[PDB]
Design a protein that fits this description.
monomer, alpha/beta, Metallo-beta-lactamase, Chain A, Rossmann fold, 7-stranded mixed sheet, 6-stranded mixed sheet, binds nickel (II) ion, DNA cross-link repair 1A protein, hydrolase, SGC - Diamond I04-1 fragment screening, PanDDA, XChemExplorer
Length: 341
């Protein structure tokens, strides 16, 4: 059955709750973003109202084939009424179309559900600043002090200078970026922009990008692999074997590969700055691991919550074991004692 952390008290609303069949009482199913963990169970066969951003609705329509009658897209930063209750969607700074949701309950309680998010100080001057938030449903993916990472901008600058150098040294090199879902598009679009190229990719991946309301998209991407010097491949192919195999496929148009694996955190975040990073190399193929995160670091999460001062926190990630829950509760009390709420 649907867990309490996916229900919104005193409404018949749920959030990211599609894998449990019909939820008893639920009149509106919200979807924060188009990642398979959150949408799991949604298909062309679902027949209840789904509320979501415009981007998320394009994806539901075109990738999952959910029927149009059941998709209710809502604009951002706008007060809307859903089944008699006032809501607002805000940018989550996660992947394309990902939202936080603000619910104003009839009794006067205010609830923020973050979805998946990367907390940022620009969220301190949104509609959130205008009133007290009593309850916070929080993306606790990286809720432990070991989880540090560079800014997105530091990582992109590094990727740009690295790719530009390699291709100026060898104008027959190919750049490859690994991918598995939506998100982290800036990695490949920034590399392509410094090399004066479009990004080549499969038909399924191009169809996905074409749903994302990215300005000038038709000038940036193509299905003609031949004509482009940045290619996208599935993350699973980003290894020496997969990359040599792909290089054979391209018809001796390239004689070298430089590949990027955007990942979350891995244990080498604890010593290495972005400027110290060096690739793994085997022959004419080099692979760079780059920690481009679309989740809050510990410090980013802590700052956001210390600013917001919620009366209660409801974790939404890593809630499956008592040890994880206990650990997280300890950090929430620390934050509250430091900040005086
Ligand atoms: Ni996500």
């Amino acid at each position: 059955t649907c867990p309490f952390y996916k229900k919104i008290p005193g409404t018949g609303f749920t959030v990211d709750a599609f894998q449990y069949g019909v939820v008893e009482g639920c009149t509106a199913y919200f979807l924060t973003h188009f990642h398979s963990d959150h949408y799991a169970g949604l298909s062309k066969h679902f027949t209840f109202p789904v509320y979501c951003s415009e981007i998320t609705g394009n994806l539901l329509k075109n990738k999952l084939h959910v029927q149009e009658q059941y998709i209710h897209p809502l604009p951002l930063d706008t007060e809307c009424i859903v089944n008699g209750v006032k809501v607002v969607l805000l940018d989550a700074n996660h992947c394309p179309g990902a939202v936080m949701i603000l619910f104003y309950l009839p009794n006067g309680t205010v609830i923020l559900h973050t979805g998946d998010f990367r907390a940022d100080p620009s969220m301190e001057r949104s509609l959130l600043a205008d009133q007290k938030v009593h309850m916070l449903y929080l993306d606790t993916t990286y809720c432990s002090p070991e989880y540090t990472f560079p800014s997105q901008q530091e990582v992109i600058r590094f990727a740009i200078n690295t790719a530009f150098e390699a291709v100026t040294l060898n104008p027959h090199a190919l750049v490859v970026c690994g991918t598995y879902s939506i998100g982290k598009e800036k990695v490949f679009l920034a590399i392509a922009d410094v090399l004066g190229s479009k990004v080549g990719m499969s038909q399924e991946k191009y169809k996905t990008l074409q749903c994302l309301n990215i300005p000038e998209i038709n000038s940036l991407i193509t299905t003609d692999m031949c004509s482009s010097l940045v290619h996208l491949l599935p993350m699973m192919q980003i290894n020496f074997k997969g990359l040599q195999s792909h290089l054979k496929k391209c018809g001796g148009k390239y004689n070298q590969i430089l590949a990027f694996r955007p990942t979350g955190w891995t244990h080498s975040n604890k010593f290495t700055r972005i400027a110290d990073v060096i690739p793994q190399t085997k022959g004419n193929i080099s692979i760079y691991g780059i920690p481009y995160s679309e989740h809050s670091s510990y410090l980013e999460m802590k700052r956001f919550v210390q600013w917001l001062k919620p009366q209660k926190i409801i974790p939404t990630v890593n809630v499956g074991t008592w040890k994880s829950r206990s650990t997280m509760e300890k950090y929430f009390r620390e934050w509250k004692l430091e900040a005086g709420y």
